[PDB]
Amino acid sequence: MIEKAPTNVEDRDKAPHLLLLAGIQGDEPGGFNATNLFLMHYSVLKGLVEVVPVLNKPSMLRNHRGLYGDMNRKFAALDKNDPEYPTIQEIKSLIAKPSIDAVLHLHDGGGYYRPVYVDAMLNPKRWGNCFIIDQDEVKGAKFPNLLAFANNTIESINAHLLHPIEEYHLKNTRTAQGDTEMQKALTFYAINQKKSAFANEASKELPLASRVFYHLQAIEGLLNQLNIPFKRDFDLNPNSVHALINDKNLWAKISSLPKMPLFNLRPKLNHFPLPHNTKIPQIPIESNAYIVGLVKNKQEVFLKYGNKLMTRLSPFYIEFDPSLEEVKMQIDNKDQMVKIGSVVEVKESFYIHAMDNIRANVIGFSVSNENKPNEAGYTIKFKDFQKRFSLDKQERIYRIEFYKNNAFSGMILVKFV
């Protein structure tokens, strides 16, 4: 759970609190890219929006609907030894918090919903591009009229259609009146705790940017109805959403290694150091996005951004010795101390000062075929690199790796600017 809050803590209780959730299925990237964009690019000025950007991360990492079954059928009867039992309890606790008023759950769904059977793509059994409630009213909720909230939100989405076929309609599933499947899903649990709960589905027939667009329209429409004031730092249109999803300023940081850009990495990174005795899902990972993770695939470790594969790591597992904190490097003529885990920009040249017991291997540079080299004490310029060893497709970014005995002391990247 990530809080989207006012900068002043006093303003939290001055408007309602919304819980926003996506990614209960790992192959519905519209939802979890929209929660990501929301987290990265919006501000909430009063009240609070609590966000779980992906409910089923393990499934997301394998581009899979659900590795342990349908997580959205686990809100009623559920076996205590179900692998997702603890996750479900966490989600139910968030939903049931007294401080929460409304819940919004994002999905991607096949085709386009219609109240009347039009054809196999457009009928009441399809889920695409609709806004969903379990009933018209929840007695005892701060905002009991779900139908009014739903219809006004739908108005707001329909003011921005990209094509008429994408028109949004209300789907009231009347869950208590015998809908067995919806009776086991998230939003029904929510209304039973007297929350106004809503679901948005964007059609899978749409490309990602358009799915996300529609999810963000639904979020904005509902926030407007709740009177949770907000801003965003961009114009909401498919192109602006596409640019923010595919944003070259996104980065990820694995363990104590340097920040690396997410987009335009070489597809495979060889001889890549990862801590030994650490399970892949436990390896610390940091990003300015919220849907990034690592996942083991055969012998490789994939870097994932939602359902996108950003690079394949071919790792070697090694002890990460934290003793080395900084290194004396000459950067464009100027000796300075560079902290392990930095990215340093280089206009012309660099040189690493020799160290007692620490050897440095600059990936892409070499003077011999020794497989465990020490390349401290060489003046290195762009011309000295074999470009194919770069981290990036643009051939500007290179790894410098430091070793002490059979331990890994850290990495610095150089970027030629």
Ligand X SMILES: N[C@H](CCC[C@H](N)C(=O)O)C(=O)O
CB of 314 vs ligand X, minimal distance in Å: 38
d(CA 72, CA 88): 9
**Is there a binding annotation on residue 375?**
yes
DSSP 39: H
CB of 140 vs Ca ion, minimal distance in Å: 24
361 contact choice in Zn ion, ligand X, Ca ion, none (CB below 5 to 8 Å, kind-dependent): Zn ion
Query: How many residues bind to Ca ion according to rule CB under 5 A?
Result: 3
> Which is closer to Zn ion, CB of 80 or CB of 372?
372
d(CA 250, CA 259): 10
DSSP 333: T
Taking CB under 5 A as the criterion, the residue among 156, 307, 390, 409 binding Ca ion is 307
User: 303 with 257: CB under 8 angstroms?
Assistant: no
User: 139 with 176: CB under 8 angstroms?
Assistant: no
Q: Quick one: which of 320, 314, 299 has its CA closest to 265?
A: 314
Give the binding site for ligand X (CB under 6 A): 72, 105, 107, 109, 127, 132, 182, 185-187, 199, 201
**Is there a binding annotation on residue 300?**
yes
152 contact choice in Zn ion, ligand X, Ca ion, none (CB below 5 to 8 Å, kind-dependent): Ca ion
CB of 212 vs ligand X, minimal distance in Å: 17
68 contact choice in Zn ion, Ca ion, ligand X, none (CB below 5 to 8 Å, kind-dependent): none
Report phi then psi at 201, rounded to 5: -115, 135
Report phi then psi at 127, rounded to 5: -115, -10
| Angle value at C-alpha 227, between 222 and 232, nearest 5 degrees | 70
Interface of this chain with Zn ion, residues 337 to 376, rule: CB under 5 A: 361-362, 365-366
Taking CB under 5 A as the criterion, the residue among 16, 26, 29, 111 binding Ca ion is 29
109 contact choice in Zn ion, Ca ion, ligand X, none (CB below 5 to 8 Å, kind-dependent): ligand X
**Is there a binding annotation on residue 167?**
yes
| Angle value at C-alpha 399, between 415 and 276, nearest 5 degrees | 145
User: Which ranges of 181-232 would DSSP assign to H, the alpha helix?
Assistant: 186-192, 208-226
CB of 372 vs Zn ion, minimal distance in Å: 5
311 contact choice in ligand X, Zn ion, Ca ion, none (CB below 5 to 8 Å, kind-dependent): none
- CB contact set of 51 (below 8 Å; sequence gap of 6+): 1, 2, 3, 4, 19, 20, 21, 35, 38, 39
User: 127 with 201: CB under 8 angstroms?
Assistant: yes
> Which is closer to Zn ion, CB of 234 or CB of 316?
316
Output the CA torsion 32→38→39→45 (10° steps).
-150
Counting contacts by CB under 5 A, is residue 221 touching Ca ion? no
> Which is closer to ligand X, CB of 90 or CB of 370?
90
Neighbouring C-beta atoms of residue 313, cutoff 10 Å: 23
199 contact choice in Zn ion, ligand X, Ca ion, none (CB below 5 to 8 Å, kind-dependent): ligand X
Residues forming the annotated binding site for Zn(2+)?
Answer: 28, 41, 79, 107, 167, 169, 233, 242, 299-300, 353, 361-362, 365, 375
Q: Which residues bind Zn ion (CB under 5 A)?
A: 361-362, 365-366
Residues forming the annotated binding site for Ca(2+)?
Answer: 25, 28, 41, 107, 152, 155, 233, 361-362, 365, 375
Q: Which residues bind Ca ion (CB under 5 A)?
A: 29, 152, 307
Residues forming the annotated binding site?
Answer: 25, 28, 41, 79, 107, 152, 155, 167, 169, 233, 242, 299-300, 353, 361-362, 365, 375
